[PDB]
């Protein structure tokens, strides 16, 4: 309850075999798809035969079956012939005004082949925001190689920052997320009230 | 038993009161002690009363008749003739892969456009020499991946199992009893995973 | 074979350690946050141990370093080059135990995650022992005292024994000291700069003749 | 080009942001007595340059490492704009720049 | 290879390393060993061996290389969707791995 | 400038330095502060000022600079090659350190 569904339009036009979703798109959760209508109806409606689907963590029995979404286990039925795969990266189109969070720590990193590499910026346990860096492809990527050497220093420090994120791009790699996660453009080792945070 | 560079890596043209060229790296009294040829071809081709210089030492042209005189380090660059070596010496032996277990990375060394080396180490004795540089060599370009892990083993104790390829020998190490050749790759030792 | 001689480096004189040995900090005795420097922080000093190490070119070198920041001080007009360090030889019994091993028998009781990489590389780098509670004068044996004049360049180095001094015929433990996993949280291991020391190593030598500098090893060992 | 030179300050803060359409990092060096120093690098809108990247390591290393350092601004224009790092110097560690 | 991706949670990376593409002088991979805790040492899960290529013409650390850094250091339990390819590490078969996530808890590592 | 090159024996570096290579804007300095390890407070090895250039265009650290890292965190004693060209660091001018090897013991370093 309370997990950031991807927009329909996340759904790629084939699944994928052997469990591998393809770079830069991952699998879709058991708990996502509940969660949403839109994409409930698509698989319904474009499903034919005796057919089932690998979701990450469950099975969707469609076609003839009706549109059964299958409680499983992470990754368990990756042997099935088609797994459902989600793109993860999202042109918002909002436009790029600053947004900061204050008191920060990042936490839990993602990483992925020719992707993106995020965290979860945590306050007091609550996650509070999701932020990711990628020298492959993003608005913000000239600053990969200078944001990884603060996110590594504040990562294994633990070091309180303030990060500060673009909602123009969202990403949806993280699985079930309580929280948003856009693009990370800049952090701050900081001084409450400082003009440098 | 040092290590001795063989003849054909003297630099027909020495460097000037100490310089030897980038790449290089003034040969040593033990070196040039040990090397037969490279001697023979000395007097062969030092017109007399002409003194030059080595790490250590200083060699008394044949006028003297030739002659491996001992000194401090620096001391024979007074003068404007230094003997050199160029460090990388093609070994023309197959591109296969070896490794030594359980070794440690220690004594760093770096040149200014040449190698960075390490001298790997198993309890007490001096295993072997590893280097890796972006300038030159074959695993050229496996340069700006390797540093960062030399650096890590060598800033902590990490035991290691360290891949060098005896394709190319490196001499940058002068008087060394060990050999030192081209780095290809490193394992933090595992046991479990049979690693060291 | 468990070391029978180990040493420690000390701003404290044979006078004092001769008499009344080193007594652990506190009672806590939880081989990680030992090893990790917590038990060695300020506001946070509670390790019953006394960090000891099995090589003397190990201390050599620490007091060798310590020496040449006395030097260091001067010349920034902070001091005058002067020196006084001690490198004390000490019988060990089986109240002495590895840290290296204390390491990793911890981590083979509660898991990889449990653990710290650096933290286990570093007792192995100290070669350190643990004394557990206190290291007494009997056990004290001899005692380098090395002088140093930074502005004449001149070393003085000089050796006293220990009357109190008993033989024994004693090794340090051939067994892991063992401790319930730790409840504390930790960042990394706390380690002193140039050479690297660890915090229960390089804290506990200082003494009464500033703070010092404590950084997290994991964000050093490895570039940016 | 009123340049200055401070030495055995502490790095306090360090910022890397996002400014128009170049990234700029600043540090805040410290010490008991004074007010705070700032200073900012900026890419200037300009490739090749490892130094952006190359100062922002080595700023990183001396916040880290918890040194004294020593550096040198370049006075902004206007008040209450940060100087220029021009050059940045990691004090002996443990001790003092002389 | 294998035939599908496997999923693992609850592993720690608990070696690292570096070696040529043993097919390609323009890729390198950055290897691994990682154990799932709980595991016994006879358990085929006590050291899952890994890989990755890395593009020797990009200058950088990947953003994978970055995480592998940070968790190998403060040794933390992840998630690796490993395969279903496999390379060559230390003379033996290691599958690929194409995405980690850290573990936030028993909820998503099982 | 100097006029030949010096060996200078358990050297160990006591502070590093950025700057700006006065000239050409492709490269910049690394410069420190080199000190014989134990000499005296005069002594003229107790201060030696070195610099060596990096190129801007390369991306990464050098062979040298992985090593002045390395040395420069661990305080180890070395054996200098300086001169015989001299660049400058504070005003006054500094030697170009041009190879460094660190030291095994009294053989190679007295
Ligand atoms: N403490 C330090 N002492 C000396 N040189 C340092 C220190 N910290 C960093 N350096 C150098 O400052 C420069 C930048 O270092 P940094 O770690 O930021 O990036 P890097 O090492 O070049 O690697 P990357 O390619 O990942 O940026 C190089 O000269 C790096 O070796």
């Given at each position: 309850?309370?997990?950031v ?12 075999p ?34 089932i ?36 990266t ?16 990042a ?16 306050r ?20 990969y ?6 996110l ?31 693009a ?11 003009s440098?945070? | ?77 007074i ?16 591109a ?20 960075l ?17 972006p ?62 | ?9 000390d ?90 091993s ?27 022992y643990?004394?557990?509670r206190?290291?007494?004068p ?53 380690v002193?700069?140039?050479?690297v ?6 804290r ?11 950084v ?9 | ?19 128009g ?13 004074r ?20 100062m ?16 040198t601004?370049?006075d ?23 | ?26 890729r ?55 395969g ?27």
């Amino acid at each position: 309850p309370g997990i950031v569904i991807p927009p329909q339009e996340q759904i790629t036009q084939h699944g994928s075999p052997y469990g591998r979703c393809a770079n830069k798109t991952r699998a879709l959760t058991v708990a996502e798809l509940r969660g949403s209508g839109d994409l409930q109806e698509y698989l319904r409606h474009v499903t034919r035969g005796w057919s089932i689907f690998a979701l990450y963590d469950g099975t969707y029995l469609g076609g003839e079956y009706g549109g059964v979404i299958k409680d499983g286990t992470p990754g368990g039925a990756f042997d099935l012939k088609t797994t459902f795969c989600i793109m993860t990266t999202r042109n918002t189109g909002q436009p790029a005004t600053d947004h900061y969070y204050s008191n920060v720590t990042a936490t839990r990193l993602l990483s992925s082949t020719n992707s993106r590499l995020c965290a979860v910026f945590v306050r007091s346990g609550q996650p509070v925001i999701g932020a990711c860096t990628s020298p492959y492809d993003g608005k913000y990527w000239s600053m990969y190689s200078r944001l990884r050497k603060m996110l590594y220093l504040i990562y294994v420090a633990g070091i309180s920052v303030r990060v500060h994120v673009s909602k123009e791009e969202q990403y949806y790699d993280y699985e079930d997320a309580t929280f948003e996660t856009y693009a990370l453009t800049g952090i701050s080792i900081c001084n409450p009230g400082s003009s440098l945070c | 038993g040092i290590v001795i560079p063989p003849k054909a890596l003297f630099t027909q043209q020495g460097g000037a009161y100490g310089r030897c060229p980038n790449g290089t790296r003034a040969l040593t009294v033990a070196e040039l002690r040990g090397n037969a040829e490279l001697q023979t071809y000395l007097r062969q081709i030092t017109p007399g009363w002409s003194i030059y210089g080595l790490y250590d030492g200083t060699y008394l042209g044949q006028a003297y008749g030739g002659i491996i005189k001992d000194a401090p380090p620096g001391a024979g660059f007074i003068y404007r003739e230094t003997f050199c070596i160029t460090t990388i010496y093609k070994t023309g032996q197959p591109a296969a892969d070896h490794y030594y277990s359980k070794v440690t990375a220690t004594r760093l060394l770096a040149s200014t456009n040449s190698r960075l080396c390490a001298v790997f180490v198993r309890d007490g004795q001096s295993v072997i020499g590893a280097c890796a540089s972006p300038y030159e060599g074959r695993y050229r370009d496996m340069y700006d991946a390797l540093r960062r892990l030399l650096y890590m083993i060598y800033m902590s104790g990490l035991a290691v199992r360290v891949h060098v390829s005896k394709e190319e020998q490196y001499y940058d190490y002068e008087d060394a009893t060990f050999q030192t050749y081209a780095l290809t790759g490193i394992s933090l030792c595992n046991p479990a995973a049979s690693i060291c | 074979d468990p070391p029978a001689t180990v040493y420690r480096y000390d701003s404290r004189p044979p006078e004092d350690v001769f008499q009344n040995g080193f007594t652990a900090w506190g009672n806590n005795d939880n081989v990680l946050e030992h090893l990790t420097g917590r038990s060695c922080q300020v506001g946070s000093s509670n390790s019953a141990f006394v960090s000891t190490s099995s090589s003397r070119r190990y201390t050599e070198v620490y007091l060798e370093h310590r020496m040449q920041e006395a030097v260091e001080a001067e010349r920034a007009g902070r001091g005058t080059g002067h020196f006084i360090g001690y490198i004390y030889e000490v019988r060990a019994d089986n109240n002495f135990y590895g840290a290296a091993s204390s390491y990793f028998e911890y981590v083979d009781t509660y898991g990889d995650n449990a653990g710290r990489i650096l933290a286990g590389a570093l007792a192995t780098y100290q070669s350190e022992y643990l004394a557990h509670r206190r290291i007494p004068p009997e056990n004290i044996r001899r005692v380098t005292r090395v002088y140093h004049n930074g502005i004449t360049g001149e070393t003085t180095t000089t050796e006293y024994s220990n009357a109190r001094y008993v033989s024994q015929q004693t090794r340090a433990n051939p067994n892991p000291y063992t401790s319930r996993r730790s409840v504390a949280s930790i960042v990394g291991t706390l380690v002193r700069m140039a050479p690297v020391v660890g915090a229960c190593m390089a804290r506990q030598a200082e003494s009464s003749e500033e703070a010092m500098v404590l950084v997290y090893y994991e964000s050093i060992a490895y570039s940016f | 080009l009123p340049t200055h030179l401070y030495k055995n300050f502490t790095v306090q803060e360090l910022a890397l942001k996002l400014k128009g359409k170049n990234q700029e990092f600043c540090l805040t060096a410290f010490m008991s007595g004074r007010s705070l120093v700032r200073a900012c690098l900026s890419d200037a809108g300009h490739e090749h340059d490892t130094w952006f990247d190359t100062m922002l390591g080595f700023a990183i290393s001396a916040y880290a490492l918890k040194s004294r350092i020593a550096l040198t601004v370049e006075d902004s224009p206007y008040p209450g704009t940060p100087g220029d790092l021009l050059e940045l110097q990691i004090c002996p560690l443990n001790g003092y720049c002389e | 290879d294998v035939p599908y991706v496997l999923v693992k949670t609850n592993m720690v990376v608990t070696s690292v390393a570096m070696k040529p593409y043993e097919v390609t002088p323009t890729r390198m991979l950055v290897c691994g060993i990682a154990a799932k805790l709980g595991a016994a040492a006879s358990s085929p899960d006590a050291h899952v061996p890994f890989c990755f290529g890395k593009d020797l013409k990009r200058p950088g650390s990947s953003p994978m290389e970055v995480m592998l850094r940070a968790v190998f250091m403060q040794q933390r339990p992840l998630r690796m969707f490993l395969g279903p390819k496999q390379l060559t590490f230390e003379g033996k078969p290691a599958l690929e791995l194409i995405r980690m996530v850290e573990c936030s808890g028993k909820q998503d590592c099982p």
